[PDB]
Amino acid sequence: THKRRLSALGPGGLSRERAGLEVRDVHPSHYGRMCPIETPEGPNIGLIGSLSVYARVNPFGFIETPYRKVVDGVVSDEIVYLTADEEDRHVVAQANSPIDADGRFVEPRVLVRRKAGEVEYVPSSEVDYMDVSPRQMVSVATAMIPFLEHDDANRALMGANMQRQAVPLVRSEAPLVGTGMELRAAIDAGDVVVAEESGVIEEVSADYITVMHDNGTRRTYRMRKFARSNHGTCANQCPIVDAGDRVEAGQVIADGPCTDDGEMALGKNLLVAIMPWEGHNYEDAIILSNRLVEEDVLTSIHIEEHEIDARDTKLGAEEITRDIPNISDEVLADLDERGIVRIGAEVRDGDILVGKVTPKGETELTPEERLLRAIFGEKAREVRDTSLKVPHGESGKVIGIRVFSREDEDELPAGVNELVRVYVAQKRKISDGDKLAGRHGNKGVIGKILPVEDMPFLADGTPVDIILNTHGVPRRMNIGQILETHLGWCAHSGWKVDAAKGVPDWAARLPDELLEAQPNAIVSTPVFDGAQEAELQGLLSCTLPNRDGDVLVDADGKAMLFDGRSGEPFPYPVTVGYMYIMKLHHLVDDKIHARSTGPYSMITQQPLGGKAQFGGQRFGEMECWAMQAYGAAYTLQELLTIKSDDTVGRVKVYEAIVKGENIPEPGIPESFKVLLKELQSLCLNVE
């Protein structure tokens, strides 16, 4: 989806602010060309679109679109790629029009899209172009949202933007309910090794597949095993065939990161209730079963790339080695004989990933330091210690080391001799704070990970995996989640429409081979042509029992959950179902941060900035207003003087705390003094 992106901003194009509210809108010529749903919800709405599923770029740079040219009310198949202009000249039908099985329409009047985008009923004599199929007005991501036509554009937009943020789990289960796009837009992603020419597997492994083609020549597909993505996510590809199988050309032969048996799978299938349980799922939060953590149902691998280089300094040459200045042997136990860590050694915040030392020269010692060196009889060790200590709050095994050397003739930037990168990995469990979110925009940080026993369970003791909240459902108009939930429970338990006496009325126009469906059987309702509500009720009424004589979900689609904590049952039946929820890439560990004294900017004497370093959160103008409105004067003086700028104030306060004295009175800030010298530099006598 980054490919297939249309961005009206850029060089030559109009910028952000200079672009008024007009171009952000959705002119009615975007239909079938640029999906009106998908777009960044930040301050770029409209300025970044994605192409429709079927669109295609005109050789001049226009966005052509397919249509089925129709004549005399006879829908042909002469697929025409009408451009953006000539669509206006014509009158364009709708795909979901009752064709009479031959190209003849059924009803006399038909909807149609007239020139300026106005909608009308024309009799079936003017209609000359009909849509190739529905969901033509929708992008690649949004096509993958089940029951899209029930959700409001707000939450559908949020869903299409959060569906590009799931992280490739370690287990990668496919979803009970989807659209058609989970497969085609998964082999087109590239991240699924595709059988090139039809042949037979000869030998497999977790690293390569050797397909024997029909005639002689063979081929070995090299799996990518644990390649760091560009955002720290694993990229395993395990193969999904056996040593005797026979693959056709163009076939899926190796799952990718989020593919299960070839098709997309951006999350798991989790039994979900819709009751507000004990306040923990308050206002978009989520409570979880602990089963997710035990069985690793939500568990992302992450692979971070640490990197240091040995430079050529004026004083000497940097040197990578176990030789380190004053340091224990325990903290140098994991390193090998030549610096870099041992492949496999677990690390933690403050370990020596690459022992690297540089010369320092000479500085007039402090005589107390000289006395201590005398009393202990240690040398000077003029080499200063700048090793690659793992940054704060990172851990996990060390997957692999990639080491370079100027000596080994590999090219590097100038003034560089040895560039070493230390790939580290860690298996983040799920955990409260993380940001799960369905496919319908309904998101929310994990609120609490309940134990498995105190989770509202069904009549079969089956606990529920997560517990969404009801008050988030109505006022957001995303009942797509509810319809997905019911259809997922049907897809799970399996149904059997009793065609004892003909076929029931609701299932008159269901497809065949949906009368009976096995348990755990996937389905798919494509976007604007899917299960109608009547079909959902009809399925749900016959939802064949599990193991005992037990239809756990009554015809309305709900159940009598037993409380896991108290013990009684709930007085009213609660909705249950299997709602496909992803694990967005807003993990807590990527956000948490703290600072008590860290680095400091060179030019200004303030704390440094951002989680990259320690840094400290901004204290803008609005917070100054708030803390004045409270009338808190001393706290404001603190935050502006002896936590940011009072250069001699910082060490004095740190001393005061450590010794237990009183915090001294803050001196003049630093930015004031700098501003004063700048003004005096402008020939403005300030005194």
Binding site: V53, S133, G250, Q251, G262, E263, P511, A517
Partner: peptide
């Protein structure tokens, strides 16, 4: 259908779309 290693995902679609989705990276 039309993709050989496909998992048999039953579908509710009432329509038979003539054209198949293009080569998504053609653009």
């Amino acid at each position: 259908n039309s993709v050989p290693g496909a998992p048999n995902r039953v579908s509710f679609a009432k329509l038979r779309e003539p054209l198949e989705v293009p080569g998504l990276l053609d653009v």
